[PDB]
Enzyme design. Structure first.
Site, PDB file in Angstrom:
ATOM      1  N   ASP A  27       0.784  -1.231   0.000  1.00 48.84           N
ATOM      2  CA  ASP A  27       0.000   0.000   0.000  1.00 48.84           C
ATOM      3  C   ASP A  27       0.815   1.279   0.000  1.00 48.84           C
ATOM      4  O   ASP A  27       1.798   1.422   0.738  1.00 48.84           O
ATOM      5  CB  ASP A  27      -0.969   0.023   1.192  1.00 48.84           C
ATOM      6  CG  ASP A  27      -2.388  -0.381   0.803  1.00 48.84           C
ATOM      7  OD1 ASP A  27      -2.740  -0.257  -0.394  1.00 48.84           O
ATOM      8  OD2 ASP A  27      -3.151  -0.820   1.689  1.00 48.84           O
ATOM      9  N   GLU A  50       9.649  -8.072   5.888  1.00 45.75           N
ATOM     10  CA  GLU A  50      10.075  -6.720   6.260  1.00 45.75           C
ATOM     11  C   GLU A  50      11.192  -6.752   7.304  1.00 45.75           C
ATOM     12  O   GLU A  50      11.986  -5.827   7.390  1.00 45.75           O
ATOM     13  CB  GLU A  50       8.907  -5.887   6.805  1.00 45.75           C
ATOM     14  CG  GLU A  50       7.860  -5.488   5.786  1.00 45.75           C
ATOM     15  CD  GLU A  50       7.077  -6.680   5.275  1.00 45.75           C
ATOM     16  OE1 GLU A  50       6.565  -7.457   6.106  1.00 45.75           O
ATOM     17  OE2 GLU A  50       6.969  -6.840   4.042  1.00 45.75           O
ATOM     18  N   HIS A 113      -8.090   0.407   6.354  1.00 50.22           N
ATOM     19  CA  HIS A 113      -7.209  -0.756   6.206  1.00 50.22           C
ATOM     20  C   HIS A 113      -5.784  -0.414   6.645  1.00 50.22           C
ATOM     21  O   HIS A 113      -5.255   0.639   6.308  1.00 50.22           O
ATOM     22  CB  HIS A 113      -7.191  -1.259   4.763  1.00 50.22           C
ATOM     23  CG  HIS A 113      -6.992  -2.738   4.643  1.00 50.22           C
ATOM     24  ND1 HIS A 113      -6.351  -3.321   3.568  1.00 50.22           N
ATOM     25  CD2 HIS A 113      -7.395  -3.759   5.435  1.00 50.22           C
ATOM     26  CE1 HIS A 113      -6.371  -4.634   3.702  1.00 50.22           C
ATOM     27  NE2 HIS A 113      -7.000  -4.926   4.827  1.00 50.22           N
ATOM     28  N   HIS A 114      -5.187  -1.319   7.411  1.00 55.54           N
ATOM     29  CA  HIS A 114      -3.842  -1.144   7.929  1.00 55.54           C
ATOM     30  C   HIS A 114      -3.761  -0.002   8.955  1.00 55.54           C
ATOM     31  O   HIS A 114      -2.751   0.698   9.037  1.00 55.54           O
ATOM     32  CB  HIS A 114      -2.852  -0.880   6.784  1.00 55.54           C
ATOM     33  CG  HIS A 114      -2.881  -1.915   5.709  1.00 55.54           C
ATOM     34  ND1 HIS A 114      -2.975  -3.262   5.976  1.00 55.54           N
ATOM     35  CD2 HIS A 114      -2.802  -1.802   4.362  1.00 55.54           C
ATOM     36  CE1 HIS A 114      -2.956  -3.937   4.839  1.00 55.54           C
ATOM     37  NE2 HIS A 114      -2.853  -3.074   3.845  1.00 55.54           N
ATOM     38  N   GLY A 412      22.613  -7.601  19.539  1.00 55.07           N
ATOM     39  CA  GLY A 412      22.497  -9.048  19.622  1.00 55.07           C
ATOM     40  C   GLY A 412      21.150  -9.696  19.370  1.00 55.07           C
ATOM     41  O   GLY A 412      20.606 -10.379  20.242  1.00 55.07           O
ATOM     42  N   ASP A 443      22.246 -23.512  14.474  1.00 55.57           N
ATOM     43  CA  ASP A 443      20.979 -24.127  14.089  1.00 55.57           C
ATOM     44  C   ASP A 443      19.769 -23.394  14.657  1.00 55.57           C
ATOM     45  O   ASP A 443      18.769 -23.222  13.972  1.00 55.57           O
ATOM     46  CB  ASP A 443      20.954 -25.576  14.577  1.00 55.57           C
ATOM     47  CG  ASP A 443      21.116 -25.677  16.090  1.00 55.57           C
ATOM     48  OD1 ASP A 443      21.800 -24.803  16.665  1.00 55.57           O
ATOM     49  OD2 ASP A 443      20.579 -26.623  16.707  1.00 55.57           O
ATOM     50  N   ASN A 470      24.458 -28.069  16.782  1.00 53.67           N
ATOM     51  CA  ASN A 470      24.784 -28.638  18.081  1.00 53.67           C
ATOM     52  C   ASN A 470      23.477 -28.980  18.765  1.00 53.67           C
ATOM     53  O   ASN A 470      23.386 -29.036  19.997  1.00 53.67           O
ATOM     54  CB  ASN A 470      25.599 -27.665  18.938  1.00 53.67           C
ATOM     55  CG  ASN A 470      25.240 -26.225  18.684  1.00 53.67           C
ATOM     56  OD1 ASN A 470      24.248 -25.938  18.021  1.00 53.67           O
ATOM     57  ND2 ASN A 470      26.048 -25.305  19.206  1.00 53.67           N
ATOM     58  N   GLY A 472      20.302 -27.432  19.311  1.00 55.64           N
ATOM     59  CA  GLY A 472      19.679 -26.632  20.361  1.00 55.64           C
ATOM     60  C   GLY A 472      20.208 -25.226  20.556  1.00 55.64           C
ATOM     61  O   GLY A 472      20.868 -24.699  19.691  1.00 55.64           O
ATOM     62  N   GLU A 476      22.482 -20.823  25.446  1.00 57.34           N
ATOM     63  CA  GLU A 476      21.479 -20.631  26.500  1.00 57.34           C
ATOM     64  C   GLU A 476      21.664 -21.655  27.616  1.00 57.34           C
ATOM     65  O   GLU A 476      21.788 -21.317  28.797  1.00 57.34           O
ATOM     66  CB  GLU A 476      20.068 -20.794  25.931  1.00 57.34           C
ATOM     67  CG  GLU A 476      19.610 -19.672  25.026  1.00 57.34           C
ATOM     68  CD  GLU A 476      19.208 -18.439  25.807  1.00 57.34           C
ATOM     69  OE1 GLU A 476      20.124 -17.723  26.278  1.00 57.34           O
ATOM     70  OE2 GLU A 476      17.983 -18.200  25.955  1.00 57.34           O
TER      71      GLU A 476
HETATM   72  C1  LIG Z   1       3.322  -7.496   6.236  1.00 57.13           C
HETATM   73  C2  LIG Z   1       2.750  -7.122   4.929  1.00 57.13           C
HETATM   74  N1  LIG Z   1       3.587  -6.705   3.925  1.00 57.13           N
HETATM   75  C3  LIG Z   1       3.085  -6.349   2.690  1.00 57.13           C
HETATM   76  C4  LIG Z   1       1.731  -6.391   2.404  1.00 57.13           C
HETATM   77  C5  LIG Z   1       1.241  -6.067   0.993  1.00 57.13           C
HETATM   78  N2  LIG Z   1       0.554  -7.193   0.212  1.00 57.13           N
HETATM   79  C6  LIG Z   1      -0.738  -7.359   0.273  1.00 57.13           C
HETATM   80  S1  LIG Z   1      -1.322  -8.680  -0.495  1.00 57.13           S
HETATM   81  C7  LIG Z   1       0.278  -9.081  -0.947  1.00 57.13           C
HETATM   82  C8  LIG Z   1       0.543 -10.362  -1.651  1.00 57.13           C
HETATM   83  C9  LIG Z   1       0.013 -11.646  -1.053  1.00 57.13           C
HETATM   84  O1  LIG Z   1       0.269 -12.568  -2.167  1.00 57.13           O
HETATM   85  P1  LIG Z   1      -0.294 -14.041  -2.298  1.00 57.13           P
HETATM   86  O2  LIG Z   1      -0.359 -14.687  -0.942  1.00 57.13           O
HETATM   87  O3  LIG Z   1       0.541 -14.649  -3.374  1.00 57.13           O
HETATM   88  O4  LIG Z   1      -1.627 -13.481  -2.907  1.00 57.13           O
HETATM   89  P2  LIG Z   1      -2.663 -13.756  -4.017  1.00 57.13           P
HETATM   90  O5  LIG Z   1      -1.871 -13.836  -5.233  1.00 57.13           O
HETATM   91  O6  LIG Z   1      -3.428 -14.973  -3.650  1.00 57.13           O
HETATM   92  O7  LIG Z   1      -3.469 -12.497  -4.031  1.00 57.13           O
HETATM   93  C10 LIG Z   1       1.177  -8.159  -0.497  1.00 57.13           C
HETATM   94  C11 LIG Z   1       2.703  -8.263  -0.639  1.00 57.13           C
HETATM   95  C12 LIG Z   1       0.880  -6.632   3.584  1.00 57.13           C
HETATM   96  N3  LIG Z   1      -0.438  -6.592   3.568  1.00 57.13           N
HETATM   97  N4  LIG Z   1       1.424  -7.043   4.788  1.00 57.13           N
HETATM   98  C1  LIG Z   2      14.834 -11.641  18.862  1.00 57.74           C
HETATM   99  C2  LIG Z   2      15.560 -12.458  19.835  1.00 57.74           C
HETATM  100  N1  LIG Z   2      14.863 -13.282  20.680  1.00 57.74           N
HETATM  101  C3  LIG Z   2      15.536 -14.067  21.620  1.00 57.74           C
HETATM  102  C4  LIG Z   2      16.923 -14.041  21.737  1.00 57.74           C
HETATM  103  C5  LIG Z   2      17.626 -14.856  22.829  1.00 57.74           C
HETATM  104  N2  LIG Z   2      18.654 -15.910  22.367  1.00 57.74           N
HETATM  105  C6  LIG Z   2      19.966 -15.675  22.427  1.00 57.74           C
HETATM  106  S1  LIG Z   2      20.843 -16.937  21.822  1.00 57.74           S
HETATM  107  C7  LIG Z   2      19.470 -17.794  21.452  1.00 57.74           C
HETATM  108  C8  LIG Z   2      19.628 -19.068  20.773  1.00 57.74           C
HETATM  109  C9  LIG Z   2      20.639 -19.110  19.544  1.00 57.74           C
HETATM  110  O1  LIG Z   2      20.968 -20.537  19.424  1.00 57.74           O
HETATM  111  P1  LIG Z   2      21.875 -21.126  18.226  1.00 57.74           P
HETATM  112  O2  LIG Z   2      21.713 -20.638  16.844  1.00 57.74           O
HETATM  113  O3  LIG Z   2      21.533 -22.530  18.425  1.00 57.74           O
HETATM  114  O4  LIG Z   2      23.303 -20.765  18.889  1.00 57.74           O
HETATM  115  P2  LIG Z   2      24.486 -21.658  19.569  1.00 57.74           P
HETATM  116  O5  LIG Z   2      23.765 -22.824  20.130  1.00 57.74           O
HETATM  117  O6  LIG Z   2      25.353 -21.909  18.382  1.00 57.74           O
HETATM  118  O7  LIG Z   2      25.077 -20.782  20.618  1.00 57.74           O
HETATM  119  C10 LIG Z   2      18.344 -17.156  21.848  1.00 57.74           C
HETATM  120  C11 LIG Z   2      16.904 -17.661  21.650  1.00 57.74           C
HETATM  121  C12 LIG Z   2      17.558 -13.023  20.900  1.00 57.74           C
HETATM  122  N3  LIG Z   2      18.845 -12.683  20.988  1.00 57.74           N
HETATM  123  N4  LIG Z   2      16.825 -12.244  20.019  1.00 57.74           N
HETATM  124 MG   LIG Z   3      22.763 -24.719  19.045  1.00 60.39          MG
END
Ligand SMILES: Cc1ncc(C[n+]2csc(CCOP(=O)(O)OP(=O)(O)O)c2C)c(N)n1
Ligand SMILES: Cc1ncc(C[n+]2csc(CCOP(=O)(O)OP(=O)(O)O)c2C)c(N)n1
Ligand SMILES: [Mg+2]
Ligand SMILES: Cc1ncc(C[n+]2csc(CCOP(=O)(O)OP(=O)(O)O)c2C)c(N)n1
Ligand SMILES: [Mg+2]
Ligand SMILES: [Mg+2]
Lengths: 555, 555, 555, 188
Positions: A27, A50, A113-114, A412, A443, A470, A472, A476
């Protein structure tokens, strides 16, 4: 001649070298998006999120200089916020542009809308205000261009996120194309003579009395156009140089006076002894300085230190506003010569010895790997490491000369690296197609922003994705809840991820024993960025680099 | 005896039946999360994304009553803002609890991690205040229990998001366990005597002067404890009933007086005329109102409307604040009896004839599918449609008796459904294991939150994921940029999506010809929610619900 | 027990001693206004102008500590802005509270009166943001009181205007009356030990090397609760003390070490010689420091000076944020003793000799009058002088011991004094009914805010209004356009002004010759604040005090 | 002012004409922006050509000759004369010239047009019911309109309009002044 505001934006961007735009259509931003396709060499990433887009835009900024993401009113802009906050926190220049509804002379009674449904259409803007350097909600094309220029100049100059709201009805109005002939001023005004002066007097005064000085490169010494000034300071003085986990990558680690990575209590005893034993500290790019509850204990009591920041000076407790580290560092470089003349080079901590041969069947271990990685890297590689074991691990690798590292140490936010690889690998393709981009991600984190690998495939990028399995959230479990269920994840067929997203020209590998690692990383066709590659490393659940298993106990 | 605040929270959440909690672990909620496990019947979703977690908390609150999601300071909480806002706009009761660093500390400048770096901690709390019915940042156990109760009550009672800030040092202190012997009062107080009264007197006079009234069910008639009163209203008056695109699901579509869905200019002529010819309108659970969109227009012909709101009354232009609908709706039914005695049962539009036997090899088209869906549906189902062609087409489906729908009509954030699906399939399960949950979503929106299928697999849930592959964002291409690159996407191997995330007992199908759909949906085994299933419906690029592709040409 | 938010506000105000509220009744603030009448000792000024009210609130703040004005949404708040800007500019604590429309769950489709008509209801708030320390637009009584407390604390603490928007529907909700038992914390947190420390070291270091020190009291040393600290510094050191036109009134002019008023080039040669010849300057309450284009040339090059501000320190170019002048001045006072022990008192400029007898028929002249005024003033008088000749004139009068002066030197908005007399005379009546308030205002300025004398009469106040009739905007003619028509005014029957506004118990006088002045100002029944009095002084068109006719040439 | 975009102004006419035809009781409503916007000619011509009843809003009072035959009175919502309130609210089509004011409530009264079938003439755009034709300035559209309206208003039936208010009846010279009497007596 005239040009449409929509096209003028992208034009300006092209001028400042932001050749890739991030985001998703929607939009009030569909017509604006037609414009980019009108400017030569501009492309539209076409993200799948986004957030991932906001992340990609950050990686891109870090590498190319600054970036730009376009989201949609309400549903789009709010999704990217966390990625914005992060760029605001770690000083990254990102221009957030949202397509806003048409600006009318009367009440927009019919806009729903929105929206929150309460009629208030400034709420999303007010929200972004908190994590923005400045914001601009344009209303009349009488000065729309000046305002665009401003948000672009502010972003680049101060390297922090800037909000630009653009009503849909204006993207198609004409503005004087002439305006495009005068580039935007991206220079910093010179410092107040009388203060920059005072600042100098003092620093030499300090450098003179100092007996054991040490240089400490930090976060803001990498993307602040101050690389030279810093390489010069190290030479002219010859003092011992050290980096912070955030500074790592901004200093040439193959330099004779490089001490290592100072992470406080997680530092190498020799490294820790050196920095703390100094009677003077010249911290360039300052931004961290103190960390107590978390990471490490790097905080002390600020024992006579000089902090060069992008906009201000900090000598002890006194602060000098406006005095910019660049021009200062320069003026401070001319006079540093004499006062350092009879300096006696203080011995610097040696390099960590490479691992000594071990049978090809020994299972992979992190400590062994982070130390072994140094042999695979090559000059010019952009390395990216995700929060968790990886983040920590990368601090123990010796960087070949001239290598850029990306680690979101302060904010972070896991997931962030996946996006960044796209943004970074993107810019990289733009500057030098032979520049490699290696990514180390655990992972647990891949799951949060996984679909962004799709955007990598569609553009035919060729990054190296190392996935650490590893099983998990190790990092943590180590600080709390070793067997906690909230710390475990769902098992995924990691490799097949590429083809699932359409990867037609790829390679997937699984390294389990030292032997397997050497054979692969040593192959000559592997060292070459020929195609996207997912390498799955199998590691233990409670295996972790040394530096982390140490602070893991107290925090 | 005592109990930790942390456990008290989950004990309270149990009592109101929020059996599942959403979100991800972080550096500030880790301890709190342990207490959930200390309460029988309680589980931890184990989300792969905070946004998805938020979408999920929404879907769950829609089916269960209210919900709760936990994120971590800065990173986790700002990742879920899009989800939250949407729940705020379409009135969903979602509690957002966030683990915050120990506010009861003596060190201020000695704490840096997951912040803007400026030292301001109220920043993320202030941001959420814009999309929260209320907030509360706990500071001392002395009244911490009351605050929790207050947040929980306000969420359920007002069906809007609430923000609850929880400092870490507080989760492990004790509060009198005796306190949980007294439940939280989820009851609404009686309206002010004389006001509710005036409302009746006035509504009755309107019901009498009307010569063609209609009952209109909107978004807030379904989840606000007002279904009884609604059915009684339809019975006592016998007025014709219609549902808005947000009301579809809250009215039995097999009822005799049911006229169809009113989607403004996208309605069936008979429906448009039927509604617009009304001289009085009783809008139960009003939310939606005159609004235009890139695709269509929506507007009630008459202004003589009486809007029934959860907390107030809207009669034409006058607003009676505080006069809650449920209790007024009652006093109304009690005095309405006589003034509706000699009412003349106006004719209502007839249902739509189910497609006529078409050769098994005819290529699937949307119009035919939305109509044919009507058959596969069984009583009890929860149908979820994603913004885009789906959301627009689910209105042309005739719902069996007692079928609930979830369409983010107002906020309209694509991606929302994959998450709401998981949360919805969760609550359903707890309510009735044999209750099915079906989801229709375009190929484009899946990319935004695809990884939440992961959390679905781990819990062994058995939903139906119908993915509409029409190669790109068709709804968008229909209002602008038919061949625009920003409306195109990366090709994905949709079916192998289940296995990649570790699905072991699944089932994938691809429907291309009308016959293939019949054979598949008429199968009795398929009709059994035995395992998670993915159906990929190959459809043409510009195909969409007939009415829609008709107004997309006029506008 | 409970108390209504409306009453709670006023209650809190009474607690902080703001016993008079300013403003005018209107939209969304009528019910709120009933409350003040509920609190003992609270009164409602009943102004005749949102501007005059904003001015009065400033005078009141200056004298009583802080103040509060209530205006109406849109038409009211915008009228008071200039008076707010002024209070923001000269550091005056003023709480601006506007009655805002009811806060609704949906779009306020029907709000139009007093609006820009574009539906945007946050515009007036956004505007006031620029001249406000902080703003608070309350939405839920869940924390409304905490928010009121905050705006009140911020205003008093930082002495700058604070915006408080209060929706009408909330003024009547109940909040826990208990909350009123814990007074608001109006104290400043102590300074960072390590910095306040550094600041000291340095200041003694500076005081030691200094050979000719001088104290300079400025604007912010009067209403910053630092009067003692300042009287002590003067004693303990015995250095020569001088004031700035903005500082005049905050230092006891009958003190043995008082040098005079330093106005740069407009200073007395002896006074100018002293200050400029100092090798160290201790400027308390700093805020001016430099003036080049206008007033005078007081700017120099900041030759080694220490600037004590309410929140920060300034030694040379170095700045110490957070270090508050109060607690500093204190810590700096204990150690100042020794370092000053052997100080040799530097001779201080003598007083200007009183005028020597002149025949009773000599016509009045400004220079003669500003020097003669010193004999009429008495200890305790609050003197107010308007921008123009008056402002300048008052700088040449020797203040009897303990006298408060009010001169809007930095903002300089004519009219402002009329309002201030009401606010000041108001507070004065509240602290000591025998305290006199003298006002000197030119003919040109009275016209801008003239009706405010009405509010003086209705409350039976007894201020002395001296009107300077030099037929025009003399001060202007002197800098430009001596005979310019835009510099002339309409003639008014000044005296009769009192009775015109209803003054029943007043006195009007007209002084034309020195004789007449002495007889009047010397009368014993005139020296007494028995009733309101307008004294019209007839002076020449181009007659002006010396100090002004000097800078009038260059500026 | 530059000429409006060809095809847009056009669509506006086509649409306004169809509305003027399906209406069975239209009214002309002068608002705040009909007076000072260089549109008085076009307004008087509209009243003449259609003969529709004309009313003014509290902001429009002054821009319409109150001695004209088709003039019905001031529409101040709930503060109107019953005849005026009924007259306006019984309209099935409304031509609002110089529209500004719209549904709004106040501490004293309420204001709201019964029907939604309204065509708002704005200085810079058009508002037909819910659709907005941006950039299509009223003055030039008002003209193109008067040129094609002629025939569709041929057999219009001149609806009755409310009558003026009788000027106060001779009251004894010593009666105390009251507002109602004064506003009425002002007329003289
Ligand atoms: C978070 C978000 N980003 C962008 C949009 C804009 N937008 C609305 S519909 C759409 C496409 C959805 O496409 P699809 O699921 O393939 O739809 P269809 O072809 O069935 O209409 C987009 C990108 C939105 N509403 N929300
Ligand atoms: C948005 C967000 N939510 C939660 C966390 C908390 N957090 C820090 S590390 C982690 C897990 C990352 O694990 P992984 O990729 O497995 O790393 P490794 O085991 O290699 O240390 C989480 C959930 C964060 N930093 N950001
Ligand atoms: Mg891990
Ligand atoms: C709001 C405002 N508008 C304009 C001015 C500019 N101005 C400064 S002095 C002055 C005239 C004051 O004249 P008067 O009271 O006659 O002073 P005197 O002749 O005694 O100097 C004017 C218009 C101002 N300060 N503030
Ligand atoms: Mg599609
Ligand atoms: Mg004068």
């Amino acid at each position: 001649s005239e040009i449409t505001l929509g096209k003028y934006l992208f034009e300006r961007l092209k001028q400042v070298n932001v050749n890739t735009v991030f985001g998703l259509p929607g939009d009030f931003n569909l017509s604006l998006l037609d414009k980019i396709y009108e400017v030569e060499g501009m492309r539209w990433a076409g993200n799948a999120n986004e957030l991932n887009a906001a992340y990609a835009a950050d990686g891109y900024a870090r590498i190319k200089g600054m970036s730009c993401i376009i989201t949609t009113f309400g549903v789009g802009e709010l999704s990217a916020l966390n990625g914005i906050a992060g760029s605001y926190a770690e000083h990254v220049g990102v221009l957030h542009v949202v397509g806003v509804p048409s600006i009318s002379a009367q009440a927009k009674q019919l806009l729903l809308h929105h929206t929150l449904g309460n009629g208030d259409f400034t709420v999303f803007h007010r929200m972004s205000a908190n994590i923005s350097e400045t914001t601009a909600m344009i209303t009349d094309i009488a000065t729309a261009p000046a305002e665009i220029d401003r948000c672009i100049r502010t972003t680049y100059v101060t390297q922090r996120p800037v909000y630009l709201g653009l009503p849909a009805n204006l993207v198609d109005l004409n503005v004087p194309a002439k305006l495009l002939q005068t580039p935007i001023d991206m220079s910093l005004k010179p410092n107040d003579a009388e203060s920059e002066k005072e600042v100098i007097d003092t620093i030499l005064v300090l450098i003179k009395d100092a007996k054991n000085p040490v240089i400490l490169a930090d976060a803001c010494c990498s993307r602040h156009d101050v690389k030279a000034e810093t390489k010069k300071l190290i030479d002219l003085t010859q003092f011992p140089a050290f980096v912070t986990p955030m500074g790592k990558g901004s200093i040439d680690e193959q330099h004779p006076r490089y001490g290592g990575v100072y992470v406080g209590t997680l530092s190498k005893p020799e490294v820790k002894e050196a920095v703390e034993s100094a009677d003077l500290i010249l911290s360039v790019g300052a931004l961290l300085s103190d960390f107590n509850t978390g990471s490490f204990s790097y905080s002390y009591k600020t024992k006579n230190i000089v902090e060069f920041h992008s906009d201000h000076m900090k000598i002890r407790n006194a602060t000098f506003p406006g005095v910019q580290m660049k021009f200062v560092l320069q003026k401070l470089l001319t006079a540093i010569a004499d006062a350092a003349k009879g300096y006696k080079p203080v011995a610097v901590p040696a390099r960590t010895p490479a691992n000594a041969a071990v049978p090809a069947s020994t299972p992979l271990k992190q400590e062994w790997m982070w130390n072994q990685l140094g042999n695979f890297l090559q000059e010019g590689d952009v390395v990216i490491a995700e929060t968790g074991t990886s983040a920590f691990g990368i601090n123990q690798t010796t960087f070949p000369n001239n290598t850029y590292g990306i680690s979101q140490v302060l904010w972070g936010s896991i997931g962030f690296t996946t996006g960044a690889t796209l943004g970074a690998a993107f810019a990289a393709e733009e500057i030098d197609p032979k520049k490699r981009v290696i990514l180390f991600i655990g992972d647990g984190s891949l799951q949060l922003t996984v679909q962004e690998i799709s955007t990598m495939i569609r553009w035919g990028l060729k990054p190296y994705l190392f996935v650490l399995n590893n099983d998990g959230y190790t990092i943590e479990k180590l600080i709390h809840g070793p067997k906690a269920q909230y710390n475990e994840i769902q098992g995924w067929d990691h490799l097949s991820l590429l083809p699932t997203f359409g990867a037609k020209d790829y390679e997937t590998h699984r390294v389990a024993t030292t032997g397997e690692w050497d054979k692969l990383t040593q192959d000559k066709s592997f060292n070459d960025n020929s195609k996207i590659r997912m390498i799955e490393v199998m590691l233990p659940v409670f295996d972790a680099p040394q530096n982390l298993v140490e602070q893991a106990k107290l925090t």
